[PDB]
Design a binder for this molecule. Sequence first.
Ligand SMILES: Nc1ncnc2c1ncn2[C@@H]1O[C@H](CSCC[C@H](N)C(=O)O)[C@@H](O)[C@H]1O
Length: 327
Amino acid sequence: MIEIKDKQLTGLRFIDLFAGLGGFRLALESCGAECVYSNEWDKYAQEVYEMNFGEKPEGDITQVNEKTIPDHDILCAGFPCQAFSIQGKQKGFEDSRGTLFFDIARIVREKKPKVVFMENVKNFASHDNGNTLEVVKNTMNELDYSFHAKVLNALDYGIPQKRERIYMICFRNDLNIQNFQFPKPFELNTFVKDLLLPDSEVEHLVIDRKDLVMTNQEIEQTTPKTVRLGIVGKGGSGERIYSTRGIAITLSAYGGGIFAKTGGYLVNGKTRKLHPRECARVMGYPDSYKVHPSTSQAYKQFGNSVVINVLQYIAYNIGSSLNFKPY
DNA sequence: TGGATGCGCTGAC
DNA sequence: GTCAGCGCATCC
Ligand SMILES: Nc1ncnc2c1ncn2[C@@H]1O[C@H](CSCC[C@H](N)C(=O)O)[C@@H](O)[C@H]1O
Protein backbone atom coordinates (compact mmCIF):
# COMPACT_ATOMS: atom_id res chain seq x y z
CA MET A 1 0.00 0.00 0.00
CA ILE A 2 1.10 3.63 -0.24
CA GLU A 3 1.11 6.51 2.23
CA ILE A 4 -1.63 9.15 2.20
CA LYS A 5 -0.43 12.55 3.39
CA ASP A 6 -3.79 14.27 2.92
CA LYS A 7 -6.24 12.27 5.03
CA GLN A 8 -9.34 13.01 2.93
CA LEU A 9 -11.52 10.71 5.03
CA THR A 10 -10.71 12.08 8.48
CA GLY A 11 -13.91 12.30 10.52
CA LEU A 12 -15.81 9.67 8.57
CA ARG A 13 -16.95 6.40 10.08
CA PHE A 14 -17.36 3.25 8.00
CA ILE A 15 -18.11 -0.47 8.34
CA ASP A 16 -16.16 -3.45 7.04
CA LEU A 17 -18.69 -5.93 5.61
CA PHE A 18 -17.42 -9.31 4.41
CA ALA A 19 -14.30 -8.06 6.17
CA GLY A 20 -11.95 -10.90 5.20
CA LEU A 21 -8.39 -9.70 5.80
CA GLY A 22 -9.54 -6.12 6.37
CA GLY A 23 -8.37 -4.79 3.02
CA PHE A 24 -10.96 -2.02 2.99
CA ARG A 25 -10.06 -1.07 6.55
CA LEU A 26 -6.36 -0.71 5.73
CA ALA A 27 -7.21 1.37 2.67
CA LEU A 28 -9.79 3.63 4.37
CA GLU A 29 -7.90 4.03 7.65
CA SER A 30 -4.87 5.20 5.68
CA CYS A 31 -7.07 8.08 4.55
CA GLY A 32 -8.16 8.84 8.10
CA ALA A 33 -11.50 7.00 8.31
CA GLU A 34 -12.55 5.22 11.48
CA CYS A 35 -13.99 1.69 11.43
CA VAL A 36 -17.07 1.38 13.64
CA TYR A 37 -18.13 -2.16 12.64
CA SER A 38 -16.84 -5.29 10.95
CA ASN A 39 -18.66 -8.45 9.88
CA GLU A 40 -17.13 -11.78 8.80
CA TRP A 41 -18.27 -15.31 9.65
CA ASP A 42 -15.26 -17.36 8.65
CA LYS A 43 -13.40 -18.62 11.70
CA TYR A 44 -9.85 -18.38 10.39
CA ALA A 45 -10.51 -15.02 8.71
CA GLN A 46 -11.88 -13.73 12.02
CA GLU A 47 -8.64 -14.89 13.67
CA VAL A 48 -6.29 -13.08 11.32
CA TYR A 49 -8.59 -10.06 11.44
CA GLU A 50 -8.52 -10.07 15.21
CA MET A 51 -4.79 -10.69 14.93
CA ASN A 52 -4.37 -7.36 13.08
CA PHE A 53 -7.10 -5.03 14.33
CA GLY A 54 -7.99 -6.34 17.78
CA GLU A 55 -11.75 -6.75 17.53
CA LYS A 56 -13.31 -9.99 16.20
CA PRO A 57 -15.82 -9.53 13.33
CA GLU A 58 -19.50 -10.26 13.92
CA GLY A 59 -20.92 -13.39 12.28
CA ASP A 60 -23.43 -14.26 9.56
CA ILE A 61 -24.51 -10.96 7.97
CA THR A 62 -27.84 -12.53 7.05
CA GLN A 63 -28.68 -13.03 10.74
CA VAL A 64 -27.75 -9.51 11.81
CA ASN A 65 -30.43 -6.87 12.13
CA GLU A 66 -29.47 -3.86 9.99
CA LYS A 67 -30.71 -1.76 12.91
CA THR A 68 -28.00 -3.33 15.07
CA ILE A 69 -25.30 -1.99 12.73
CA PRO A 70 -23.73 1.25 14.10
CA ASP A 71 -24.09 4.53 12.21
CA HIS A 72 -21.52 5.21 9.48
CA ASP A 73 -20.70 7.38 6.46
CA ILE A 74 -19.27 4.71 4.14
CA LEU A 75 -20.30 1.06 3.76
CA CYS A 76 -17.47 -1.14 2.56
CA ALA A 77 -18.42 -4.50 1.09
CA GLY A 78 -16.46 -6.76 -1.21
CA PHE A 79 -19.18 -9.40 -1.30
CA PRO A 80 -18.58 -13.03 -2.48
CA CYS A 81 -17.92 -13.86 -6.13
CA GLN A 82 -17.76 -17.63 -6.74
CA ALA A 83 -21.29 -17.19 -8.11
CA PHE A 84 -20.14 -14.39 -10.43
CA SER A 85 -16.59 -15.49 -11.17
CA ILE A 86 -15.65 -16.67 -14.65
CA GLN A 87 -14.09 -19.82 -13.20
CA GLY A 88 -17.13 -20.55 -11.04
CA LYS A 89 -20.36 -21.93 -12.46
CA GLN A 90 -21.93 -18.49 -12.55
CA LYS A 91 -25.20 -19.46 -10.87
CA GLY A 92 -25.33 -15.83 -9.70
CA PHE A 93 -28.28 -14.78 -7.53
CA GLU A 94 -29.35 -18.41 -7.70
CA ASP A 95 -26.34 -19.32 -5.64
CA SER A 96 -26.70 -19.41 -1.87
CA ARG A 97 -23.63 -17.16 -1.94
CA GLY A 98 -24.86 -15.02 -4.80
CA THR A 99 -27.55 -13.20 -2.84
CA LEU A 100 -25.35 -11.36 -0.35
CA PHE A 101 -25.71 -8.07 -2.20
CA PHE A 102 -29.37 -8.03 -1.15
CA ASP A 103 -28.22 -8.11 2.47
CA ILE A 104 -26.00 -5.13 1.68
CA ALA A 105 -29.04 -3.46 0.18
CA ARG A 106 -31.19 -4.01 3.26
CA ILE A 107 -28.43 -2.50 5.38
CA VAL A 108 -28.30 0.57 3.16
CA ARG A 109 -32.08 0.96 3.14
CA GLU A 110 -31.89 1.20 6.94
CA LYS A 111 -28.57 2.84 7.76
CA LYS A 112 -28.57 5.17 4.75
CA PRO A 113 -24.81 5.90 4.67
CA LYS A 114 -23.26 8.68 2.62
CA VAL A 115 -21.29 6.24 0.46
CA VAL A 116 -21.39 2.55 -0.48
CA PHE A 117 -18.02 1.24 -1.64
CA MET A 118 -18.32 -2.22 -3.17
CA GLU A 119 -16.03 -4.64 -5.00
CA ASN A 120 -16.54 -7.86 -6.95
CA VAL A 121 -14.84 -9.67 -9.86
CA LYS A 122 -14.61 -8.47 -13.49
CA ASN A 123 -17.11 -11.04 -14.78
CA PHE A 124 -19.66 -9.45 -12.41
CA ALA A 125 -19.98 -6.46 -14.76
CA SER A 126 -21.02 -8.59 -17.74
CA HIS A 127 -22.55 -11.55 -15.95
CA ASP A 128 -25.95 -12.72 -17.14
CA ASN A 129 -25.93 -10.25 -20.02
CA GLY A 130 -25.08 -7.35 -17.73
CA ASN A 131 -28.40 -7.90 -15.98
CA THR A 132 -26.60 -8.46 -12.70
CA LEU A 133 -24.65 -5.21 -12.71
CA GLU A 134 -27.90 -3.48 -13.58
CA VAL A 135 -29.78 -5.03 -10.65
CA VAL A 136 -27.05 -3.78 -8.34
CA LYS A 137 -27.36 -0.45 -10.14
CA ASN A 138 -31.14 -0.04 -10.22
CA THR A 139 -31.27 -1.29 -6.65
CA MET A 140 -28.81 1.37 -5.55
CA ASN A 141 -30.68 4.06 -7.49
CA GLU A 142 -33.97 2.96 -5.93
CA LEU A 143 -32.21 3.37 -2.60
CA ASP A 144 -31.55 7.00 -3.66
CA TYR A 145 -27.86 6.61 -4.54
CA SER A 146 -25.74 7.35 -7.59
CA PHE A 147 -24.00 4.38 -9.19
CA HIS A 148 -20.42 4.69 -10.46
CA ALA A 149 -18.93 1.39 -11.55
CA LYS A 150 -15.80 0.53 -13.45
CA VAL A 151 -13.40 -2.36 -13.90
CA LEU A 152 -9.83 -1.59 -12.85
CA ASN A 153 -6.71 -3.72 -13.29
CA ALA A 154 -4.31 -3.56 -10.33
CA LEU A 155 -1.37 -3.51 -12.75
CA ASP A 156 -2.46 0.03 -13.68
CA TYR A 157 -2.02 1.31 -10.12
CA GLY A 158 1.41 0.15 -8.99
CA ILE A 159 0.83 -3.51 -8.12
CA PRO A 160 2.33 -6.28 -10.28
CA GLN A 161 -0.83 -8.39 -10.61
CA LYS A 162 -3.39 -8.77 -13.38
CA ARG A 163 -6.31 -8.54 -10.98
CA GLU A 164 -9.30 -7.03 -12.78
CA ARG A 165 -12.20 -6.11 -10.53
CA ILE A 166 -15.33 -4.03 -10.62
CA TYR A 167 -15.48 -1.22 -8.10
CA MET A 168 -18.89 0.29 -7.42
CA ILE A 169 -18.97 3.64 -5.69
CA CYS A 170 -22.33 5.00 -4.55
CA PHE A 171 -23.13 8.46 -3.13
CA ARG A 172 -26.42 9.34 -1.40
CA ASN A 173 -28.20 11.71 -3.77
CA ASP A 174 -28.79 14.56 -1.32
CA LEU A 175 -25.00 14.99 -1.35
CA ASN A 176 -25.25 15.98 -5.02
CA ILE A 177 -21.75 14.59 -5.68
CA GLN A 178 -20.97 15.26 -9.34
CA ASN A 179 -17.18 15.04 -9.51
CA PHE A 180 -16.24 11.54 -8.46
CA GLN A 181 -13.71 9.90 -10.73
CA PHE A 182 -11.94 6.58 -10.74
CA PRO A 183 -8.16 6.88 -10.32
CA LYS A 184 -6.38 7.52 -13.61
CA PRO A 185 -3.89 4.69 -14.40
CA PHE A 186 -0.13 5.11 -14.32
CA GLU A 187 3.08 3.44 -15.48
CA LEU A 188 3.96 0.25 -13.58
CA ASN A 189 7.51 0.07 -12.23
CA THR A 190 7.31 -3.02 -10.04
CA PHE A 191 6.99 -6.63 -11.04
CA VAL A 192 6.85 -10.03 -9.40
CA LYS A 193 10.67 -10.01 -9.10
CA ASP A 194 10.65 -6.98 -6.79
CA LEU A 195 8.37 -8.57 -4.19
CA LEU A 196 9.93 -12.01 -3.84
CA LEU A 197 11.47 -13.08 -0.54
CA PRO A 198 15.06 -14.40 -0.37
CA ASP A 199 15.56 -17.90 -1.83
CA SER A 200 16.51 -19.08 1.64
CA GLU A 201 12.94 -18.47 2.80
CA VAL A 202 11.10 -20.27 0.01
CA GLU A 203 12.98 -23.52 -0.68
CA HIS A 204 10.05 -25.52 0.67
CA LEU A 205 7.86 -23.97 -2.01
CA VAL A 206 10.21 -25.30 -4.71
CA ILE A 207 8.58 -27.77 -7.09
CA ASP A 208 10.67 -29.92 -9.41
CA ARG A 209 8.15 -31.70 -11.61
CA LYS A 210 9.50 -34.11 -14.20
CA ASP A 211 6.54 -33.07 -16.37
CA LEU A 212 7.47 -29.40 -16.61
CA VAL A 213 7.22 -28.35 -20.25
CA MET A 214 8.81 -24.92 -20.65
CA THR A 215 6.67 -23.47 -23.43
CA ASN A 216 8.48 -20.13 -23.75
CA GLN A 217 11.84 -18.47 -23.17
CA GLU A 218 12.38 -16.26 -20.13
CA ILE A 219 12.15 -12.53 -20.82
CA GLU A 220 14.97 -10.03 -20.55
CA GLN A 221 12.92 -6.89 -19.98
CA THR A 222 10.15 -6.42 -17.42
CA THR A 223 6.56 -5.99 -18.58
CA PRO A 224 3.22 -4.89 -17.18
CA LYS A 225 1.69 -8.23 -18.18
CA THR A 226 1.59 -11.90 -17.23
CA VAL A 227 4.18 -13.83 -19.17
CA ARG A 228 3.64 -17.59 -19.22
CA LEU A 229 6.85 -19.58 -19.56
CA GLY A 230 5.80 -23.17 -19.08
CA ILE A 231 3.40 -25.90 -18.07
CA VAL A 232 3.15 -28.75 -15.58
CA GLY A 233 0.46 -31.40 -16.00
CA LYS A 234 -2.29 -30.46 -18.47
CA GLY A 235 -1.47 -26.84 -17.68
CA GLY A 236 -4.85 -26.08 -16.12
CA SER A 237 -5.27 -23.75 -13.14
CA GLY A 238 -2.30 -24.00 -10.81
CA GLU A 239 -0.31 -25.73 -13.54
CA ARG A 240 1.03 -22.65 -15.31
CA ILE A 241 4.45 -21.05 -14.82
CA TYR A 242 5.11 -17.36 -15.37
CA SER A 243 8.05 -14.99 -15.59
CA THR A 244 8.91 -13.03 -12.45
CA ARG A 245 9.96 -10.26 -14.85
CA GLY A 246 6.27 -9.66 -15.62
CA ILE A 247 3.27 -9.20 -13.33
CA ALA A 248 1.61 -11.94 -11.25
CA ILE A 249 -1.65 -13.67 -12.18
CA THR A 250 -4.81 -13.28 -10.11
CA LEU A 251 -4.58 -14.94 -6.71
CA SER A 252 -7.54 -17.25 -5.95
CA ALA A 253 -9.21 -18.50 -2.76
CA TYR A 254 -10.22 -22.08 -3.57
CA GLY A 255 -7.64 -22.51 -6.32
CA GLY A 256 -6.27 -25.92 -7.13
CA GLY A 257 -3.38 -27.32 -9.13
CA ILE A 258 0.12 -27.98 -7.82
CA PHE A 259 0.91 -24.23 -7.75
CA ALA A 260 -2.41 -23.82 -5.98
CA LYS A 261 -3.82 -20.36 -5.35
CA THR A 262 -0.77 -18.37 -6.49
CA GLY A 263 0.37 -19.99 -9.69
CA GLY A 264 3.93 -21.09 -10.39
CA TYR A 265 6.94 -18.91 -11.17
CA LEU A 266 10.41 -19.29 -12.63
CA VAL A 267 12.79 -18.06 -9.94
CA ASN A 268 16.56 -18.37 -10.24
CA GLY A 269 16.41 -21.51 -12.38
CA LYS A 270 13.70 -23.15 -10.26
CA THR A 271 9.89 -23.25 -10.27
CA ARG A 272 7.75 -22.62 -7.16
CA LYS A 273 4.48 -21.05 -6.02
CA LEU A 274 4.30 -17.78 -4.10
CA HIS A 275 4.81 -17.61 -0.33
CA PRO A 276 2.07 -16.07 1.89
CA ARG A 277 4.21 -12.95 2.42
CA GLU A 278 4.70 -12.69 -1.33
CA CYS A 279 0.95 -13.03 -1.73
CA ALA A 280 0.58 -10.17 0.76
CA ARG A 281 3.00 -8.00 -1.17
CA VAL A 282 1.40 -8.82 -4.52
CA MET A 283 -1.90 -7.67 -2.89
CA GLY A 284 -0.58 -4.33 -1.63
CA TYR A 285 -0.33 -5.45 1.97
CA PRO A 286 2.36 -3.91 4.18
CA ASP A 287 4.92 -6.32 5.58
CA SER A 288 3.63 -5.38 9.03
CA TYR A 289 0.45 -7.28 8.28
CA LYS A 290 0.35 -10.49 10.31
CA VAL A 291 -0.63 -13.35 8.01
CA HIS A 292 -2.55 -16.33 9.39
CA PRO A 293 -0.39 -19.12 10.93
CA SER A 294 -2.09 -21.67 8.65
CA THR A 295 -0.52 -21.10 5.25
CA SER A 296 -3.44 -22.82 3.53
CA GLN A 297 -5.85 -20.43 5.22
CA ALA A 298 -3.57 -17.47 4.53
CA TYR A 299 -3.47 -18.36 0.82
CA LYS A 300 -7.28 -18.59 0.81
CA GLN A 301 -7.49 -15.20 2.47
CA PHE A 302 -5.18 -13.37 0.11
CA GLY A 303 -6.93 -15.00 -2.82
CA ASN A 304 -10.24 -13.61 -1.59
CA SER A 305 -8.74 -10.24 -0.69
CA VAL A 306 -8.30 -6.86 -2.38
CA VAL A 307 -5.36 -4.79 -3.69
CA ILE A 308 -5.04 -2.08 -1.02
CA ASN A 309 -3.40 0.54 -3.23
CA VAL A 310 -6.29 0.42 -5.71
CA LEU A 311 -8.70 0.85 -2.78
CA GLN A 312 -6.60 3.69 -1.42
CA TYR A 313 -6.83 5.77 -4.58
CA ILE A 314 -10.57 5.09 -4.93
CA ALA A 315 -10.93 6.07 -1.29
CA TYR A 316 -8.89 9.22 -1.76
CA ASN A 317 -11.18 10.19 -4.63
CA ILE A 318 -14.35 9.44 -2.68
CA GLY A 319 -13.27 11.85 0.06
CA SER A 320 -11.80 14.31 -2.45
CA SER A 321 -15.40 14.49 -3.62
CA LEU A 322 -17.20 14.53 -0.25
CA ASN A 323 -14.93 17.50 0.63
CA PHE A 324 -15.79 19.70 -2.36
CA LYS A 325 -18.41 21.84 -0.60
CA PRO A 326 -18.08 25.22 -2.40
CA TYR A 327 -20.31 28.18 -1.63
C1' DT B 1 -15.20 -23.08 8.82
C1' DG B 2 -9.01 -28.74 7.41
C1' DG B 3 -5.18 -29.55 3.47
C1' DA B 4 -3.76 -30.88 -1.18
C1' DT B 5 -4.46 -30.91 -6.05
C1' DG B 6 -6.25 -32.73 -10.83
C1' DC B 7 -9.61 -30.57 -13.76
C1' DG B 8 -13.83 -28.44 -16.50
C1' DC B 9 -15.14 -24.87 -19.21
C1' DT B 10 -16.69 -20.06 -19.81
C1' DG B 11 -15.23 -15.33 -21.25
C1' DA B 12 -12.94 -12.17 -24.11
C1' DC B 13 -9.58 -12.11 -27.44
C1' DG C 1 -7.15 -21.52 -31.40
C1' DT C 2 -5.38 -18.67 -27.16
C1' DC C 3 -5.30 -18.27 -22.20
C1' DA C 4 -6.49 -16.77 -17.79
C1' DG C 5 -9.91 -17.33 -13.75
C1' DC C 6 -11.77 -13.98 -5.11
C1' DG C 7 -13.54 -21.85 -8.67
C1' DC C 8 -15.15 -26.90 -8.24
C1' DA C 9 -14.74 -31.96 -7.27
C1' DT C 10 -12.73 -35.61 -4.80
C1' DC C 11 -9.36 -37.62 -1.81
C1' DC C 12 -7.34 -38.59 2.74
N1 LIG D 1 -23.08 -14.61 5.36
C1 LIG D 1 -21.88 -14.10 5.54
N2 LIG D 1 -21.67 -13.36 6.68
C2 LIG D 1 -20.46 -12.81 6.93
N3 LIG D 1 -19.36 -12.89 6.17
C3 LIG D 1 -19.61 -13.65 5.02
C4 LIG D 1 -20.79 -14.26 4.64
N4 LIG D 1 -20.65 -14.93 3.43
C5 LIG D 1 -19.42 -14.73 3.08
N5 LIG D 1 -18.71 -13.96 3.99
C6 LIG D 1 -17.32 -13.56 3.90
O1 LIG D 1 -17.23 -12.71 2.77
C7 LIG D 1 -15.88 -12.58 2.38
C8 LIG D 1 -15.83 -12.26 0.89
S1 LIG D 1 -14.21 -12.00 0.12
C9 LIG D 1 -13.85 -10.29 0.68
C10 LIG D 1 -12.52 -10.13 1.41
C11 LIG D 1 -12.24 -8.69 1.88
N6 LIG D 1 -12.41 -7.59 0.89
C12 LIG D 1 -10.79 -8.48 2.37
O2 LIG D 1 -10.06 -7.51 1.96
O3 LIG D 1 -9.97 -9.50 2.32
C13 LIG D 1 -15.26 -13.91 2.81
O4 LIG D 1 -14.14 -13.76 3.71
C14 LIG D 1 -16.43 -14.66 3.44
O5 LIG D 1 -16.05 -15.54 4.54
